[PDB]
Amino acid sequence: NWLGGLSRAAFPKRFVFGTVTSAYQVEGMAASGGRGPSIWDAFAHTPGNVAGNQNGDVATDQYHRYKEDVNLMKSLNFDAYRFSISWSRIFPDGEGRVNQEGVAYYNNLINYLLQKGITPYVNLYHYDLPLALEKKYGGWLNAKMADLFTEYADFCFKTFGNRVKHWFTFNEPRIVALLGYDQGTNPPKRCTKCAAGGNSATEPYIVAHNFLLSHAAAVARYRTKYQAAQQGKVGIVLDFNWYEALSNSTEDQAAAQRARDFHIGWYLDPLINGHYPQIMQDLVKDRLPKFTPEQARLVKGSADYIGINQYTASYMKGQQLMQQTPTSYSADWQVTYVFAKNGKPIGPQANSNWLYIVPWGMYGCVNYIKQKYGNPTVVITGNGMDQPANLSRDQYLRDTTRVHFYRSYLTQLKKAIDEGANVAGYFAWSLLDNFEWLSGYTSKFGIVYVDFNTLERHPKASAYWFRDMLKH
Ligand SMILES: [Zn+2]
């Protein structure tokens, strides 16, 4: 059967199912409604940065159509909606003056979701730093971000927290550090060889440290001032793709493990255990900032749940560890990526080159967190795959590969849960085809098709798959 035995009865009682978007990817109204520019506005408006010189000026126009989109998610039998608040739509300069029109938009969205029985899971930050903060402070290179993020977070807790009980601070800070400061392909486009300046060996570590300190400061504020009255929770969203040893050799197993620690341990070891992974301490040395005892105690235990975005898996091949001149965060791992074992590829690729369809990666990731980190409360905060550009409407709608993706990945998730993994919910990336950063509109992750000429929504087969699977 096309559900493959999956239904709500196959997951724990009260398990949360939802879909995800992010502000800049779906809202539109990027320079209207009082919204100030983000670093992505500036980046996307520079010729050559995004596929087809496209931007999020209009995107899916959810800003106007949110009630349509909420009605649709409810008709598809989802329980929750993960979306993000645009910082610069609340604070056009990221500090100081409040944009009341921006506040009303989020009030209206939140109130409508609640009216329709959909639980809001709210992200504070999803790559969209107010441009004014980038220019004035140097963004995430500056430790002052903790104070700036905390004041932002405080406003949002005050303003929406009588209704919103499930918060996230950040979305995938590893991607910010990697793409913005190591490879320099996302804003602020910084790296060792980059026009804007930078240093791929040091800056990604600075950035990540500042994300962790900002997260911890925001949570400290939540807990000391709002928790008692509001009684909600705050977590963080971390990306985690799976690494599998290419062979059972000591070297390859050590490689896969290093990759895990440099990928997920970078953030999880501080959040759970109050220190960076030992291997990162040993290899990165003085390029890795040190938490004071006070800071480490602020960071440790500061996430009420861990969001994991899980997409793919890779084989890892190891080498003997060498003394090396530092070049980059990426090169610091001392691993080789491999995409075939015994002559067979790990999986076919979706539209995005990095996304290999590997359902057992989901089991790998969830089981690993369960076994290594004391089985913390995990929420799968994003999981999905993309179709390419230029297909006909009907081709988009008949997304059989995506149907197969979700059934297989959710089966593997069910396997980990049945074995005792503390997973509280699952969210599909994405509700709608949207602005997919560097790929602009050439990458389609939605379970709902969006015609980018007319802006019409059309549910795909995978939407109907969810609707069947999630019926009450
Ligand atoms: Zn509109």
Side-chain angles (χ1 to χ4, degrees):
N1 176 268
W2 92 316
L3 301 176
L6 304 165
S7 74
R8 283 182 183 277
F11 293 85
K13 297 64 61 226
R14 310 273 282 138
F15 192 86
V16 178
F17 282 98
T19 64
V20 199
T21 59
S22 86
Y24 190 73
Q25 299 183 272
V26 305
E27 286 179 3
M29 291 299 264
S32 317
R35 179 168 182 282
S38 78
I39 54 172
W40 262 94
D41 298 83
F43 177 94
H45 272 74
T46 307
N49 277 346
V50 173
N53 295 328
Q54 301 294 307
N55 51 60
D57 284 357
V58 178
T60 78
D61 193 34
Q62 185 167 92
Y63 192 94
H64 288 139
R65 311 172 72 112
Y66 67 94
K67 283 185 193 185
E68 184 193 359
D69 288 350
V70 169
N71 284 354
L72 193 58
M73 65 192 71
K74 197 205 173 58
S75 86
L76 298 169
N77 295 315
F78 291 103
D79 311 306
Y81 184 43
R82 179 182 159 229
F83 67 91
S84 81
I85 291 161
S86 188
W87 194 337
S88 66
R89 184 182 306 282
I90 308 292
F91 293 94
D93 309 307
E95 50 179 358
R97 191 183 50 87
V98 172
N99 175 36
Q100 284 302 336
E101 187 172 2
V103 174
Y105 173 70
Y106 298 110
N107 274 323
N108 289 332
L109 174 51
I110 292 163
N111 290 340
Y112 195 69
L113 293 156
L114 289 174
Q115 186 199 128
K116 302 293 290 194
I118 310 299
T119 314
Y121 280 61
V122 183
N123 245 98
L124 296 174
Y125 187 85
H126 195 133
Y127 307 154
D128 51 355
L129 189 73
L131 183 59
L133 297 184
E134 183 65 34
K135 279 182 201 294
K136 178 181 175 179
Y137 297 95
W140 299 105
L141 289 170
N142 193 327
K144 183 78 183 162
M145 285 308 300
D147 281 352
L148 294 154
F149 184 67
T150 298
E151 295 312 309
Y152 166 53
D154 184 297
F155 182 76
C156 294
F157 301 144
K158 190 192 284 165
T159 313
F160 312 110
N162 290 332
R163 285 157 290 139
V164 174
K165 308 309 186 181
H166 304 86
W167 297 98
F168 300 97
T169 54
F170 301 108
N171 180 85
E172 298 167 319
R174 194 197 76 93
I175 303 294
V176 179
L178 174 76
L179 299 186
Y181 297 85
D182 177 350
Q183 291 184 13
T185 48
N186 275 34
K189 296 183 82 174
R190 286 179 70 89
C191 75
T192 309
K193 68 183 182 150
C194 289
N199 181 335
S200 313
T202 61
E203 293 196 347
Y205 296 109
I206 294 159
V207 168
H209 200 70
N210 284 337
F211 275 119
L212 288 158
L213 291 172
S214 304
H215 170 86
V219 167
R221 173 68 51 90
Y222 188 77
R223 286 175 181 167
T224 62
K225 183 175 178 184
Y226 298 101
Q227 180 267 327
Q230 294 181 0
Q231 290 163 41
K233 288 164 182 176
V234 184
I236 188 164
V237 172
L238 306 168
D239 58 295
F240 187 21
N241 295 307
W242 181 245
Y243 300 104
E244 181 80 5
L246 179 62
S247 74
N248 209 34
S249 67
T250 292
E251 209 176 36
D252 289 355
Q253 291 286 357
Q257 185 52 45
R258 270 202 301 290
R260 285 161 204 140
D261 289 326
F262 270 88
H263 194 127
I264 186 71
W266 195 10
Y267 300 90
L268 264 195
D269 271 276
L271 294 167
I272 309 291
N273 297 319
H275 55 80
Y276 287 119
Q278 192 60 64
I279 195 69
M280 296 190 65
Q281 288 179 57
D282 296 332
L283 299 177
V284 184
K285 304 182 176 75
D286 288 321
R287 291 175 297 122
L288 191 67
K290 276 149 194 62
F291 295 105
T292 65
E294 297 66 32
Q295 285 163 345
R297 183 64 270 189
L298 198 64
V299 175
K300 188 187 162 176
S302 67
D304 299 328
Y305 38 63
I306 314 297
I308 299 300
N309 292 349
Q310 209 292 308
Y311 297 100
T312 191
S314 317
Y315 294 119
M316 281 304 104
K317 180 168 172 65
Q319 55 219 58
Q320 225 261 53
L321 287 167
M322 289 185 295
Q323 177 87 285
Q324 291 175 8
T325 298
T327 68
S328 75
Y329 158 77
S330 297
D332 280 336
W333 307 20
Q334 295 189 49
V335 300
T336 297
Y337 292 75
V338 170
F339 297 93
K341 182 186 190 162
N342 300 313
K344 287 202 189 199
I346 195 178
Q349 291 159 102
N351 168 71
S352 298
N353 301 342
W354 55 265
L355 205 169
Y356 291 80
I357 304 179
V358 191
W360 58 261
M362 172 70 71
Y363 174 85
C365 283
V366 168
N367 181 65
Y368 172 80
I369 288 165
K370 164 181 138 73
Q371 308 271 99
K372 190 166 207 289
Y373 292 99
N375 204 12
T377 305
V378 164
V379 176
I380 302 310
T381 40
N383 176 236
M385 54 152 279
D386 58 339
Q387 288 153 303
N390 307 328
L391 298 187
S392 71
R393 181 212 285 168
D394 287 310
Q395 286 170 149
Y396 281 116
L397 300 189
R398 296 184 307 258
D399 62 343
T400 177
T401 305
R402 184 177 292 99
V403 171
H404 184 201
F405 183 102
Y406 285 118
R407 181 183 46 235
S408 293
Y409 271 71
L410 286 165
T411 302
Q412 291 290 314
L413 183 59
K414 175 178 168 52
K415 183 185 178 185
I417 302 178
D418 290 355
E419 287 178 10
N422 198 11
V423 187
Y426 174 92
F427 288 77
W429 184 273
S430 177
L431 171 66
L432 303 168
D433 295 332
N434 57 64
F435 179 74
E436 179 52 38
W437 311 118
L438 291 180
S439 305
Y441 303 93
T442 69
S443 167
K444 280 69 171 59
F445 273 102
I447 60 162
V448 172
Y449 170 66
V450 175
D451 181 320
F452 289 100
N453 294 322
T454 72
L455 294 170
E456 297 167 285
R457 278 66 164 144
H458 300 283
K460 308 184 196 171
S462 58
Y464 292 112
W465 187 88
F466 275 109
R467 186 183 74 178
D468 280 5
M469 201 271 283
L470 298 176
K471 60 199 287 204
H472 295 96

